[PDB]
Amino acid sequence: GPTIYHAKDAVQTTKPSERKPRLVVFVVGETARADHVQFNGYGRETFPQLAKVDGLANFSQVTSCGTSTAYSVPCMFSYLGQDDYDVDTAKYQENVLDTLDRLGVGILWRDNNSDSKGVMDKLPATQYFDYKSATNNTICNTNPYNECRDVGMLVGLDDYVSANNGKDMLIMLHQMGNHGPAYFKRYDEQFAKFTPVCEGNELAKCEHQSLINAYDNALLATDDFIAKSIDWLKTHEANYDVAMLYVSDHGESLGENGVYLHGMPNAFAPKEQRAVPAFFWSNNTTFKPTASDTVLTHDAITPTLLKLFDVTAGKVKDRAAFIQ
């Protein structure tokens, strides 16, 4: 077959029948910058709800694999690491979700962003769902753009847990997040807290503060979405050990030295396109976050996902992770 394997040696060292089963939501973020999170030194509370969640760990020194969704998302789930990663061949490689699925962890991917950028392609199509349209997402009529919202991806998840009751499960929610350039469209009116707001496509012609304000209002909506994802997990914490991982795919330039948007090649790109937020929450000490200021990259995601399910694989031994 065409697949290039990397973890045929992978084994789950404790089974869900020998301990509490585990239920994890991985929010795959979009366009959020580390330096616009107050936990990392920003001067506005852009994540006020997460700031009040007990057990929410922040990671202040995370760098993305790349500067675009197409480059970063496959690398986030890769075994190869940023040094060997090749965007053009990523789809042929066994990735961490392929491994976990083979080992019996339920894999679900809901997408309100674009698609999985090849990550889900080898797995059954019934495990991938497009949440960008109102035919699948029930929450698209809350704004004048008729734009489907990330919180719609929480609806019906209890069916998945019930269908896989007693097993380990990993649910990816690929959110619209801070996708630009129309940051002002990314949030409903209750999050229009920082004003005034850039509403034009020529971002350089907006007042800089108005551009920042639109971007930060979109972060408030993501704060809300992540908090609601934690609320959902808590409804299952009697029977499951639950956890939420959030990592953004890349950052965004907002006019520094006249640069806007993202996508600059890694060798040239400014720090704002690479420094990304990451958060981890869990309900108890089954999982323990790594020290908040540990220097980490997207290479830490695959080892984190394996460790969350007690899976060992030689390819990622000694790699740092977001949990101990």
Q: Which is nearer to Br ion, 214 or 300 (CB)?
A: 214
Least CB distance to Br ion at residue 44 (A)? 5
Beta strand pairing call for 241-248 and 278-282: antiparallel
Site for Zn ion in 144-173 (CB under 5 A): none
Q: Is there binding between residue 216 and Zn ion (CB under 5 A)?
A: no
Closest among 278, 211, 292, 311 to 72, alpha carbons compared? 278
Q: Is there binding between residue 234 and Br ion (CB under 5 A)?
A: no
Q: Which residues of 199-216 are buried (b: 16+ CB within 10 A; e: fewer)?
A: eeeebeebeeebbbbbbb
CB contact set of 132 (below 8 Å; sequence gap of 6+): 111, 112, 113, 114, 148, 176
Alpha helices in the chain (DSSP H): 69-76, 81-84, 96-102, 157-163, 208-234, 301-308
Least CB distance to Zn ion at residue 31 (A)? 5
**Pick from Br ion, Zn ion, none: which does 60 bind, CB < 5 to 8 A by kind?**
none
Which listed residue (168, 249, 272, 299) binds Zn ion by CB under 5 A?
249
Q: Is there binding between residue 167 and Br ion (CB under 5 A)?
A: no
**Region from 36-44, 68-76, 114-122, 219-227 binding Br ion, contact rule CB under 5 A:** 36-44
The answer to whether the CB of 40 falls within 8 A of the CB of 258 is no
Q: Is there binding between residue 272 and Zn ion (CB under 5 A)?
A: no
Q: Which is nearer to Zn ion, 34 or 233 (CB)?
A: 34
Which pair of structure tokens corresponds to residue 208? 């800089």
Site for Zn ion in 25-54 (CB under 5 A): 30
Q: Is there binding between residue 253 and Zn ion (CB under 5 A)?
A: no
Q: Is there binding between residue 69 and Zn ion (CB under 5 A)?
A: yes
Residues in a beta bridge with 297: 63
Q: Is there binding between residue 102 and Br ion (CB under 5 A)?
A: no
Q: Alpha-carbon distance 207 to 311, whole Å?
A: 50
Total chain residues near Zn ion (CB under 5 A): 3
Q: Alpha-carbon distance 59 to 216, whole Å?
A: 19
**Pick from Zn ion, Br ion, none: which does 249 bind, CB < 5 to 8 A by kind?**
Zn ion
**Pick from Br ion, Zn ion, none: which does 44 bind, CB < 5 to 8 A by kind?**
Br ion
3-state secondary structure of 306: helix
Under DSSP, the state recorded for 155 is T
CB contact set of 215 (below 8 Å; sequence gap of 6+): 36, 178, 180, 183, 252, 254
Total chain residues near Br ion (CB under 5 A): 1
DSSP 58-93: E-SSEE-S-SSHHHHHHHHT-SSHHHH--TTTGGGB
Q: Is there binding between residue 193 and Br ion (CB under 5 A)?
A: no
**Region from 67-75, 119-127, 152-160, 185-193 binding Zn ion, contact rule CB under 5 A:** 67-75
Q: Is there binding between residue 111 and Zn ion (CB under 5 A)?
A: no
Give the residue numbers of the binding site for Zn(2+).
Answer: 30, 69, 249-250
**Region from 42-50, 166-174, 250-258, 266-274 binding Br ion, contact rule CB under 5 A:** 42-50
Give the residue numbers of the binding site.
Answer: 30, 69, 249-250
Computed over its alpha carbons, how large is the radius of gyration of the chain? Answer: 19
Q: Is there binding between residue 228 and Br ion (CB under 5 A)?
A: no
Least CB distance to Zn ion at residue 4 (A)? 25
**Region from 41-49, 69-77, 137-145, 316-324 binding Br ion, contact rule CB under 5 A:** 41-49
Q: Alpha-carbon distance 234 to 197, whole Å?
A: 35
CB contact set of 114 (below 8 Å; sequence gap of 6+): 69, 132, 174
Q: Is there binding between residue 44 and Br ion (CB under 5 A)?
A: yes
Query: What are the residues binding Br ion (CB under 5 A)?
Result: 44
Query: What are the residues binding Zn ion (CB under 5 A)?
Result: 30, 69, 249
